[PDB]
Write a protein that binds this ligand. Structure first.
Ligand SMILES: CCCCCCCCCCCCCCCCCC(=O)OC[C@H](COP(=O)([O-])OCC(O)COP(=O)([O-])OC[C@@H](COC(=O)CCCCCCCCCCCCCCCCC)OC(=O)CCCCCCCCCCCCCCCCC)OC(=O)CCCCCCCCCCCCCCCCC
Ligand SMILES: CCCCCCCCCCCCCCCCCC(=O)OC[C@H](COP(=O)([O-])OCC(O)COP(=O)([O-])OC[C@@H](COC(=O)CCCCCCCCCCCCCCCCC)OC(=O)CCCCCCCCCCCCCCCCC)OC(=O)CCCCCCCCCCCCCCCCC
Ligand SMILES: CCCCCCCCCCCCCCCCCC(=O)OC[C@H](COP(=O)([O-])OCC(O)COP(=O)([O-])OC[C@@H](COC(=O)CCCCCCCCCCCCCCCCC)OC(=O)CCCCCCCCCCCCCCCCC)OC(=O)CCCCCCCCCCCCCCCCC
Ligand SMILES: [Zn+2]
Lengths: 462, 35, 49, 485, 192, 33
């Protein structure tokens, strides 16, 4: 009867249900088009999402997929390098691209009136690019330089080394750039072979968001993407083998690069379509992140996150400069773990504290911790869907992974019914007493043994 | 333990008591290595 | 919800009886001024001097 | 043409009835009533679990800005785009430009004491409850404005409003809390030293407006610690933190609901009373300053004054000129005429910093520390030709500027900061459609007119890094005078 | 799912407390029963006159004479080993802290000699509560910390970092973490 | 309370009290009731 028991208990806000639909169509040649109209915008983002990457390179030509990225902006039959650059500038538009292990993306940002001219440019550079042998030799100097700057961003180097040792027996372990000797001996014939084997109509999605009309985007695509080859099958219906996960360590000791070490640990995860994928997203948020030079308004020593609290109070001074948990999904496997930076003499304490927090998911996590993590996850995910680019990336990425876009209300309904007993079930099945892979760099004299890390995945209490 | 010129640490975090013997025998990896 | 101190009788106001009561409201002063007089150094028991 | 504000009157309400409207909130979970578990176990994400009762016909929201005002003078403005994460902000017209020799550092102190103990909530319970809600909040100090902000799920807005307004309504300023914050108060400028770009900017302001208004520093110094006591702080808030000097803004909220909860935060207690203050006009002096530091590059910056600032009448002209030259692109004047013709230049750009009634405009370059004398000659030559542009350059700049504006305003945070910042500086919000109409009306004569006026006052020169070959003050001034500057 | 059923019982009893919780101050109910409050009031005029009354008066005389012999106040008898009182002492202003320091020094010296003060140095009331405002603020600070951080039995790494792992933060205060080093010159936790 | 590792003495306290309540209840039922 107390007013303290008549509070407004609205689980999922009504705004989650009153969202504009994402419209989809499949064309005769196999290209898929997907659009969501956001009336409160004057600009728009349109792009092409392709289901190919470094994992679809050959061992002898690892690196052609990234090489092709650069050459796609060097000239066509109807436009030259200079002409392409000037046309974009004269409209005030933007044109970007990136390549990963399983997905490749090209997108543009411009006004509504300039959308057709963007679709024309995207189809041309993707289907009619001239791979001049003379330009292939010039780029070799711009790419060998990028391999030196990438070696200066340490976090990117550590995650590559983590893929190299974990997936030794699969193309999923290849690097995106490729070895040096492959870059030096690259020819235009290696690049054309990658195109003819990977860029087909069944592996491409066109997505848009903003002040966009669906029927008009479906007619422009039907006209400009007609010269796209269809898949050829030689009566071969053989399935792909799931990558094998190797428990191993790969460490670069170096006492001449300062007092800070860098480390990353990984577990075998789950693929996109797994019935347990949502729970892995949540488990990533329970471990969370921390930066010593950017705590915010909550001091780390009194944080609600148990992992942060234990790390900040270690030896009364704190044992980490920063750490963060990650979860990455692929088509047939995944990768779950954490990255960290720390002082030479603090490395052992730091790594073992974060391991202790992951293993707590199987034994002792509380519903207060789960609901704190849920609230943070919702604020970040739902907050990043503001611009037209982030929305378009969400459409395209989901069309390749799931075959559809999940509405916001469905995600929130699936996230709502996950409690502490369901977290314990999933962690007991996948993370408890499991194999781990490790990569590291720097002053590593105090690094734990691989077997120490392997046995920290279970407790002897209980 | 190790000689003084090898025991010198690069970091500043304090040595924990369970690790006293580890750091009494610190040795610099002259030239580096990959394991 | 603790009991509200009666300042007219000389009762002490400190801790929870400042934060969770309206004892510090004054109609003819801004709130930032009134509550500045309710720190523990502002009170002294009769007979102190 | 100021906007028309709707009135929201104070109303007395029964406390027990208003509690039926507070959103549910839990800190403890003592058992659980539901016992059904994960009802979607075993179902993969390529399959949908929604039902027909979860489908709706979309109805667009109210995306225009709505305006309202309370009886104590607080101005309110909000807009709804249909998102699920809201942005909230409280803007106060009380920046470092209002400090004096007995107060330097007070605004920085108030920023670092944000979300401390108030009359009805302690420090620990305030920061711990925000975290458990999943929100982020903070306070940022500036030269003209102070801003408190938070972001959260849009159903938690009523819970976050009091934790924002309490900082300006009834803070306590307890001694032992001031003594625990004194550490982080000095580490700010220390962390600023190892940030070259931020140090060059500070040096530019301290040198442009010598010992007045916009030239005061942002952060405290060891000298400031001599007046770090509650009485000095509370005296500063009584002069500047009245409701008439504040604006509240929200994005992805219901306008009427935001007004109701803001009214309830102010109805039972007394706010700081208004006061008449006279705003001193800035005095631009220019000058020169050097700062040697270990670095492989020689940082150099040269600037001039912009008369009138945001309200001078030529804001759009300076933003078009900035786009022609090049900011933070491969057909800009600085990329073609400077970078490509000199391999010893590492970077170059143009900046435009405007305030309510004054601003500066200039260039910023990094270069080889052995060719600083040549860096000065190239910068002077660019200033000598700034007042001349071609039709192709001008037309390409306009198109680039319009696109940037609309694109920037796709993000919640930028929209909130722009609306609040405009209502304090001009009591009006200029739409992006009105900016475009103004951009299109910029001519070649306007450019040439504003560059000449810019050069009627002395320059402001700054050098940072390795300054072993940087010419003498008189030589920099002379080089500019030979190029017609 | 046996854990979810037990959680339903806890939750039912929890919701009942909340639905019956008042939203304003209400006096606490009488502790003693009516049968006990009737015998006491009937025997009061005789029990109080000849026993309980003189017991109360002797007690205050014994306390006052001992404190005055040593020049002490009653509140000087509390220890800084109590967490609440330790926090209260940290909040004191200089003038009150200095007078307490001096009285404690003088009282240890007088107890060592076993010599009374003269009568004219004993003319003061020792029962003035000079610590009360600081004690009530300390209680508020520590009750918040306990409710916001100490509502669960947390796990931890055992015998790591100088502590046991069961909740202690200051190192070397339990026997199974005694003797931190065999070699060296040791060190102080206050100089980390 | 939060911050210290005195974790066995609170258990000893509850066992001792319970033991006393049982000793003096087993004697009364044998002598009185
Ligand atoms: C008449 C004859 C009668 C004789 C009878 C005497 C009794 C005989 C006992 C035989 C026991 C055999 C089984 C041994 C297993 C030990 C436990 C274990 O698995 O350790 C894992 C433990 C942690 O494993 P991990 O891989 O690091 O981490 C995995 C998880 O991630 C970590 O997950 P987590 O964080 O949840 O786990 C933390 C870890 C806690 O980890 C720690 O922090 C360290 C734990 C301490 C080391 C393990 C205990 C054994 C140490 C031997 C001490 C002997 C002293 C001899 C003095 C004799 C004086 C006469 O948890 C524990 O293990 C807690 C302890 C469990 C409760 C106690 C039961 C085990 C005690 C075994 C006997 C010791 C007491 C005997 C005293 C005799 C006095 C007369 O391993 C270590 O610490 C590494 C070194 C271990 C050395 C083991 C040596 C065994 C020898 C036992 C015989 C005792 C000698 C008696 C002499 C009598 C003469 C009269
Ligand atoms: C693996 C090898 C094979 C054999 C393995 C054997 C088993 C090993 C693992 C066993 C389980 C380990 C995990 C324990 C629970 C941790 C839970 C947790 O994270 O909470 C942290 C929790 C702190 O939570 P908090 O809220 O921050 O503070 C709680 C407040 O202080 C007070 O809060 P409050 O006032 O609300 O009171 C709370 C109280 C409410 O409950 C009650 O009051 C109920 C009272 C029931 C009375 C009737 C039943 C009898 C209970 C015991 C009576 C006293 C026994 C005294 C024994 C002394 C000698 C050991 O809760 C409890 O009583 C729960 C604790 C019950 C467990 C005790 C027995 C099992 C654990 C024994 C220690 C583990 C081995 C360490 C070995 C180290 C070797 C180097 O810490 C504990 O409660 C720790 C309890 C365990 C004792 C500490 C370690 C003692 C070390 C010295 C003895 C070493 C002997 C070695 C040789 C002999 C062989 C072992
Ligand atoms: C070192 C520098 C100098 C140079 C080097 C020196 C080198 C030499 C040093 C030694 C080197 C070797 C290492 C030795 C290790 C020894 C083990 C050790 O250190 O453990 C410390 C360890 C404390 O570790 P901690 O790190 O300080 O704190 C632990 C927690 O983290 C935090 O816990 P907490 O702080 O919350 O509470 C801790 C508290 C926890 O307190 C308790 O749990 C209570 C313990 C005492 C209970 C008994 C006392 C009387 C109580 C009333 C009667 C009760 C009757 C039973 C019924 C009860 C109701 C059901 O413990 C104490 O108060 C400490 C008491 C000391 C016990 C030491 C005994 C060791 C074993 C040998 C026993 C021999 C007995 C002979 C006499 C009897 C012969 C018939 O102590 C224990 O927890 C073990 C308790 C063992 C109790 C045994 C009781 C036996 C007698 C029971 C009564 C029977 C009456 C029958 C009458 C029949 C008439 C016919
Ligand atoms: Zn590249």
């Amino acid at each position: 009867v107390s007013p303290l028991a008549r509070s407004v208990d609205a689980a999922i806000p009504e705004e989650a249900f009153n969202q504009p639909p994402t419209l989809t169509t499949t064309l005769p040649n196999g290209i898929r088009v997907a659009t969501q109209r956001l009336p409160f915008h004057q600009t728009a983002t349109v792009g092409v999402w392709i289901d190919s990457g470094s994992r679809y390179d050959t061992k002898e030509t690892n690196g052609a997929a990234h090489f092709l990225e650069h050459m796609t902006f060097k000239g066509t039959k109807r436009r030259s390098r200079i002409q392409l650059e000037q046309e974009i500038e004269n409209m005030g538009a933007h044109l970007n691209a990136y390549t990963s292990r399983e997905q490749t993306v090209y997108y543009a940002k411009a006004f509504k009136k300039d959308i057709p001219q963007c679709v024309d440019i995207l189809s041309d550079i993707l289907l009619n690019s001239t791979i001049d042998e003379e330009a292939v030799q010039m780029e070799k100097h711009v790419i060998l330089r990028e391999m030196e700057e990438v070696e200066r961003q340490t976090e990117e180097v550590i995650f590559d080394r983590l893929h190299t040792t974990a997936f030794r027996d699969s193309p999923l372990g290849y690097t995106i750039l490729g070895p040096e000797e492959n870059i030096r001996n690259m020819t235009r014939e290696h690049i054309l072979e990658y195109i003819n084997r990977n860029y087909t109509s069944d592996r491409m999605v066109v997505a848009a968001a903003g002040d966009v009309d669906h029927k008009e985007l479906t007619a422009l695509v039907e006209k400009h993407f007609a010269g796209l080859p269809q898949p050829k099958r030689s009566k071969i219906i053989l399935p792909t083998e799931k990558p094998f996960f190797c428990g191993s360590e790969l460490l670069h000791r170096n006492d001449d690069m300062g007092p800070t070490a860098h480390v990353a640990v990984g577990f075998e995860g789950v693929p996109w379509k797994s019935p347990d994928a949502v729970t892995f997203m949540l488990m990533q948020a329970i471990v969370g992140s921390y930066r010593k030079h950017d705590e915010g308004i909550v001091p780390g020593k009194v944080s609600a996150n148990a992992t942060v609290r234990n790390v900040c109070n270690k030896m009364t001074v704190g044992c980490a400069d920063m750490f963060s948990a990650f979860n990455t999904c692929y088509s047939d496997t995944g990768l779950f773990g954490f990255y960290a930076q720390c002082d030479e003499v603090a490395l052992e304490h730091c790594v073992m504290e974060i391991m202790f927090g992951i293993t707590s998911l199987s034994y002792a996590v509380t519903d207060e911790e789960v609901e704190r993590a849920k609230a943070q996850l919702k604020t970040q995910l739902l907050g990043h869907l503001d611009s037209t680019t982030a929305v378009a990336e969400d459409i395209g990425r989901q069309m390749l992974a799931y075959g559809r876009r999940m509405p916001l209300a469905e995600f929130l309904k699936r996230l709502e019914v996950i409690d502490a007993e369901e977290v314990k079930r999933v962690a007991w099945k996948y993370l408890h007493d499991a194999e781990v892979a490790v990569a590291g760099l720097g002053p590593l004299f105090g690094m734990p043994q691989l077997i120490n890390l392997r046995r920290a995945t279970f407790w002897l209490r209980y | 333990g190790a000689p003084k010129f090898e025991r010198k640490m690069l970091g500043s975090y304090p040595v924990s008591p369970e690790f006293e013997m580890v750091w009494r025998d610190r040795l610099t990896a002259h030239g580096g290595y990959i394991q | 919800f603790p009991r509200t101190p009666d300042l007219s009788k000389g009762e002490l106001a400190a801790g929870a009886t400042v934060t969770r009561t309206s004892v510090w409201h004054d109609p003819n002063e801004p709130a930032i001024v009134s509550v500045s007089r309710f720190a523990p150094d502002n009170f002294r028991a009769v007979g102190f001097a | 043409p100021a906007p028309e504000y709707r009135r929201v009157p104070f109303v007395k309400e029964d406390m027990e009835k208003v509690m039926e409207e507070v959103p549910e909130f839990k800190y403890y979970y003592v058992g659980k009533e539901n016992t059904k578990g994960n009802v979607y176990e075993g179902i993969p994400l390529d399959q949908s679990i929604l039902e027909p009762a979860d489908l709706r016909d979309y109805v667009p929201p109210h995306s225009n800005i709505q305006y309202s005002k309370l009886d104590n003078g607080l101005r309110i403005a909000s807009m709804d785009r249909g998102g699920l994460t809201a942005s909230l902000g409280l803007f106060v017209h009380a920046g470092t430009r209002f400090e004096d020799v007995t107060n330097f550092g007070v605004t920085h102190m108030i920023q670092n004491l944000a979300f401390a103990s108030t009359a009805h909530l302690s420090l620990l319970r305030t920061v711990k409850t925000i975290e458990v809600l999943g929100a982020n909040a903070g306070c940022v100090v500036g030269r003209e404005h102070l801003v408190y902000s938070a972001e959260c799920l849009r159903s938690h807005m009523p819970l976050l409003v009091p934790m924002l307004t309490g900082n300006v309504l009834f803070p306590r300023f307890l001694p032992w809390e001031l003594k625990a914050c004194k550490e982080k108060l000095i580490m700010a400028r220390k962390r600023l030293e190892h940030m070259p770009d931020q140090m060059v900017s500070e040096l530019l302001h301290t040198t442009a407006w010598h010992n007045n208004t916009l030239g005061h520093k942002l952060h405290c110094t060891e000298r400031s610690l001599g007046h770090y006591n509650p009485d000095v702080i509370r005296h500063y808030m009584l002069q500047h933190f009245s409701p008439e000097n504040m604006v509240f803004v929200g994005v992805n909220v219901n306008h009427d609901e935001l007004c109701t909860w803001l009214m309830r935060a102010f109805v039972d207690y007394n706010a700081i009373p208004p006061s008449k203050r006279t705003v001193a006009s800035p005095v631009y002096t220019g000058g020169d300053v050097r700062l040697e530091t270990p670095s492989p590059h020689a940082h150099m910056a040269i600037a001039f004054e912009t008369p009138g600032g945001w309200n001078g009448g030529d804001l759009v002209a300076y933003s078009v000129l900035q786009t022609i030259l090049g900011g933070g692109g491969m057909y800009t004047r600085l990329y073609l005429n400077v970078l490509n013709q000199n391999e010893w230049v590492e970077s170059a750009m143009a900046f435009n910093t405007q305030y309510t009634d004054s601003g500066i405009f200039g260039l910023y370059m990094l270069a080889d520390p052995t060719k600083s004398a040549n860096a000065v000659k190239v910068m002077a030559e660019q200033f000598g030709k700034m007042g001349s542009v071609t039709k192709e350059e001008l037309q390409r700049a306009k198109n680039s500027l319009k696109s940037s504006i609309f694109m920037n305003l796709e993000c919640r945070g930028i929209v909130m900061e722009d609306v609040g910042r405009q209502l304090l500086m001009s009591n009006r919000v200029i739409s992006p459609q009105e900016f475009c109409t103004a951009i299109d009306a910029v001519t070649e004569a306007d450019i040439k007119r504003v560059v000449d006026a810019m050069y009627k006052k002395p320059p402001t020169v700054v050098a940072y890094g390795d300054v072993s070959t940087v010419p003498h003050y008189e030589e920099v001034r002379a080089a500019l005078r030979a190029a017609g500057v | 799912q046996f854990h979810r059923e037990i959680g339903k019982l806890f939750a039912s009893y929890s919701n009942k407390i909340t639905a019956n919780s008042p939203v304003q101050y209400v006096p606490s109910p009488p502790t003693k029963g009516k049968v006990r409050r009737a015998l006491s009031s009937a025997l009061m005029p005789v029990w109080f006159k000849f026993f309980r009354g003189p017991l109360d008066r002797w007690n205050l005389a014994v306390m006052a004479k001992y404190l005055r012999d040593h020049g002490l106040m009653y509140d000087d008898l509390y220890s800084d080993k109590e967490p609440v009182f330790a926090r209260a002492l940290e909040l004191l202003p200089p003038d009150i802290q200095a007078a307490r320091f001096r009285r404690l020094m003088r009282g240890t010296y007088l107890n060592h000699l076993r010599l009374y003060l003269p009568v004219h140095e004993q003319n003061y009331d020792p029962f003035i509560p000079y610590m009360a405002p600081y004690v009530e603020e300390a209680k508020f600070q520590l009750q918040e910390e306990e409710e916001l951080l100490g509502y669960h039995m947390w796990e931890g790494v055992w015998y790591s970092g100088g502590v046991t792992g069961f909740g202690d933060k200051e190192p070397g205060e339990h026997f199974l973490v005694a003797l931190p080093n065999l070699y060296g010159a040791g060190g102080s936790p206050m100089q980390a | 309370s939060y911050g210290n590792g005195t974790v066995l003495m609170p258990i000893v306290r509850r066992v001792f009290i319970g033991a006393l309540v049982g000793i003096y209840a087993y004697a009364a039922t044998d002598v009185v009731l």
